[PDB]
Amino acid sequence: SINDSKILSLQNKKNTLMDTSGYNAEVRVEGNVQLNPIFPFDFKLGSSGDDRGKVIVTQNENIVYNAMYESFSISFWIRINKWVSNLPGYTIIDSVKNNSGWSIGIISNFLVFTLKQNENSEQDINFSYDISKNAAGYNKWFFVTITTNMMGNMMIYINGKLIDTIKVKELTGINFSKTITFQMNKIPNTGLITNINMWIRDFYIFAKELDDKDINILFNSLQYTNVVKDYWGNDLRYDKEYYMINVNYMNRYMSKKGNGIVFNTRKNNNDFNEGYKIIIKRIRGNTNDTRVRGENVLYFNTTIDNKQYSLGMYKPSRNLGTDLVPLGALDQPMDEIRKYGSFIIQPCNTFDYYASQLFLSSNATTNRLGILSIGSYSFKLGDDYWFNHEYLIPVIKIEHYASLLESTSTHWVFVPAS
């Protein structure tokens, strides 16, 4: 429906970056530019140095001429790795020729879109990520949508959510360029406090001002909503090490005491690399392509010392509560896993994160018996003898969990150990 207004569609087809809108913009790729052979078929650039990648798109002057001066929208998927809060300034997508046009850059925790009328004046709008919720850096895939009405407002959306909006000021003289250059270029004197990478996927430009509904329909249509994602937004996969974390306790890592899995406070936030890792193993599912999907039935393995355990329910020293059963690490055969450690996964994405919900499976079928949550309980594990101790543990609420169905305490994330 809105495709009728699409004037640029930068995509990777047949291992070749090209415009598929129909207006045949010219695409030139120079330097260190890597193309992903599998979905999402993104192209990767780096702040590298010598031959840092560079993608140049030159469109039709007339097409630009009869669109950019009224209403237009820019949309694309992007990922920046190690987008730390004190990152210096970088221009990443530039369309400024003679000190006029538009540009997209980053500085600190900000992503900013600039309308540049001349070397002396400009107007910009921005998105600043929540530092407290992204201590290890905002290194996840996110969907950008910038809408501009030269006689109205300039608005920026992130993952379909309106972030900022401002009335476009008088910018007479602004001359839009028909060239767009994708390249990570450092901006001098922007607080150089150190090499970063950037991934771009499906860069589109529409000759209209996309509204909220349009934006979100676009957002969703570019995703395979039943494929669960890891913390950075990549497809979640079986047979791969991940750090399993609960959205409510990002500063906790997985440890073990006796039969129980317990969560400890991590040392710092420069990484998520602390504690034991889990490996997801498939039991049941429609497609069988290594990717973890919605209604799949699966289980979790983990290597502690030089032995491997599977996550499974166990009997605590004392009852923890009505309909509550702790989840631990057990060296058990498959028949036991099917009864006490099999889960049905469901993707659960929000503006803030890519996550999932895990439901206890009934004998490895798609029939649900409970939901996986987390909480602190006082009991005894391992060598505990004289007293009970509070342990933050993964716990399953059996039959009655309607209220938990909406709790973020049931949202689990997976950070690739890589």
Side-chain angles (χ1 to χ4, degrees):
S1 184
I2 68 297
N3 289 297
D4 291 355
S5 59
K6 182 186 290 183
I7 56 176
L8 174 59
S9 179
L10 180 56
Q11 282 180 154
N12 168 189
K13 255 66 189 302
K14 307 177 181 182
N15 193 57
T16 301
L17 284 181
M18 62 180 273
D19 172 18
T20 63
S21 70
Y23 301 91
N24 297 290
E26 178 190 358
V27 185
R28 289 175 174 292
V29 59
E30 304 179 355
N32 186 188
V33 177
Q34 308 177 200
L35 302 185
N36 186 177
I38 66 173
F39 186 88
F41 312 107
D42 57 84
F43 61 87
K44 180 191 181 182
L45 279 54
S47 54
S48 171
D50 307 298
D51 259 49
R52 70 164 62 72
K54 180 181 184 180
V55 177
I56 306 173
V57 180
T58 305
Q59 51 215 324
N60 180 295
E61 58 185 0
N62 299 302
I63 295 302
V64 176
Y65 189 78
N66 295 76
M68 304 295 275
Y69 295 93
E70 297 188 300
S71 283
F72 66 81
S73 295
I74 300 173
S75 70
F76 60 92
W77 278 94
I78 176 171
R79 186 192 175 197
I80 301 174
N81 184 40
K82 236 55 188 61
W83 181 4
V84 291
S85 67
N86 69 157
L87 185 74
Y90 286 92
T91 295
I92 51 174
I93 306 175
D94 189 74
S95 198
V96 168
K97 174 54 192 174
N98 292 296
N99 291 302
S100 196
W102 62 258
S103 187
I104 293 177
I106 57 179
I107 184 171
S108 296
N109 56 143
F110 298 82
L111 173 76
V112 12
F113 171 82
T114 303
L115 234 34
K116 189 188 189 65
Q117 67 172 304
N118 58 51
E119 65 278 356
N120 200 173
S121 46
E122 62 194 12
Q123 181 170 35
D124 58 35
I125 187 172
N126 73 258
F127 156 54
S128 61
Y129 73 77
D130 186 317
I131 301 179
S132 75
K133 299 181 179 178
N134 301 278
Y138 197 88
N139 323 312
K140 63 196 65 184
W141 272 107
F142 64 100
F143 185 66
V144 175
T145 303
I146 295 168
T147 67
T148 296
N149 180 329
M150 294 304 282
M151 15 275 265
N153 299 316
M154 209 190 320
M155 310 183 281
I156 182 168
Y157 301 77
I158 295 300
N159 297 328
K161 299 294 182 179
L162 176 60
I163 297 296
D164 192 34
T165 163
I166 72 174
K167 169 70 172 177
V168 177
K169 69 174 188 178
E170 180 70 19
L171 301 171
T172 30
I174 188 164
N175 194 306
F176 289 115
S177 167
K178 45 69 165 302
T179 294
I180 302 171
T181 301
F182 291 78
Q183 177 176 58
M184 307 191 82
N185 301 318
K186 177 67 170 61
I187 300 169
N189 302 127
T190 47
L192 173 56
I193 304 179
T194 55
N195 60 307
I196 58 181
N197 291 101
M198 169 176 76
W199 291 264
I200 293 298
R201 166 214 148 173
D202 293 302
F203 185 89
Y204 303 169
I205 292 183
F206 297 91
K208 72 173 295 184
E209 197 195 335
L210 300 180
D211 61 31
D212 283 65
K213 184 175 181 177
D214 294 355
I215 286 174
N216 286 82
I217 285 180
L218 182 59
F219 178 44
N220 292 147
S221 74
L222 275 46
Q223 290 176 280
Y224 286 94
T225 63
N226 198 49
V227 172
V228 181
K229 308 302 194 308
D230 70 13
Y231 194 59
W232 307 131
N234 303 305
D235 296 343
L236 188 68
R237 309 201 321 275
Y238 289 107
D239 317 334
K240 179 174 174 53
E241 285 185 338
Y242 288 103
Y243 285 103
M244 194 174 103
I245 312 174
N246 188 281
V247 164
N248 278 22
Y249 301 79
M250 293 305 292
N251 277 142
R252 294 277 164 152
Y253 67 80
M254 259 180 51
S255 188
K256 173 180 181 290
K257 184 163 185 178
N259 294 303
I261 287 297
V262 301
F263 293 92
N264 297 335
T265 301
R266 67 180 70 252
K267 189 178 182 302
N268 56 244
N269 297 306
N270 45 52
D271 278 353
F272 284 100
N273 298 54
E274 178 160 28
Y276 302 129
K277 289 162 278 187
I278 59 78
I279 293 174
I280 313 169
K281 302 297 293 175
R282 166 188 162 80
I283 300 172
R284 283 190 173 69
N286 284 58
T287 308
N288 192 180
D289 71 340
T290 302
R291 298 181 175 77
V292 182
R293 293 190 172 70
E295 287 293 293
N296 286 8
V297 184
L298 48 77
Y299 64 99
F300 304 94
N301 269 164
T302 180
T303 298
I304 276 54
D305 269 50
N306 275 294
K307 317 204 328 80
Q308 215 177 203
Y309 304 78
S310 56
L311 300 192
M313 295 178 282
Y314 66 91
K315 187 175 185 296
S317 60
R318 47 148 61 155
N319 192 307
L320 304 182
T322 305
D323 299 303
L324 293 170
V325 54
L327 187 70
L330 315 166
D331 191 337
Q332 58 190 172
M334 198 55 59
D335 283 354
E336 297 308 300
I337 293 178
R338 301 174 80 75
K339 297 181 297 187
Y340 311 121
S342 301
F343 300 81
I344 299 159
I345 192 169
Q346 195 63 208
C348 184
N349 304 148
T350 65
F351 173 83
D352 291 318
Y353 51 76
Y354 294 102
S356 64
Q357 276 185 137
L358 292 157
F359 300 93
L360 174 62
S361 165
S362 182
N363 290 123
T365 60
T366 45
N367 298 301
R368 308 178 180 185
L369 298 182
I371 189 174
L372 181 64
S373 191
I374 189 170
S376 184
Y377 301 89
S378 176
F379 62 118
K380 304 177 175 177
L381 288 173
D383 64 4
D384 286 342
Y385 188 85
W386 301 106
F387 303 107
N388 284 291
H389 305 271
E390 285 281 339
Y391 289 110
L392 179 57
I393 62 161
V395 63
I396 300 175
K397 177 62 186 300
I398 299 306
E399 189 186 312
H400 308 83
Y401 58 86
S403 296
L404 277 175
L405 207 60
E406 291 301 75
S407 181
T408 52
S409 69
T410 62
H411 297 357
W412 297 89
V413 166
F414 301 92
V415 183
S418 288

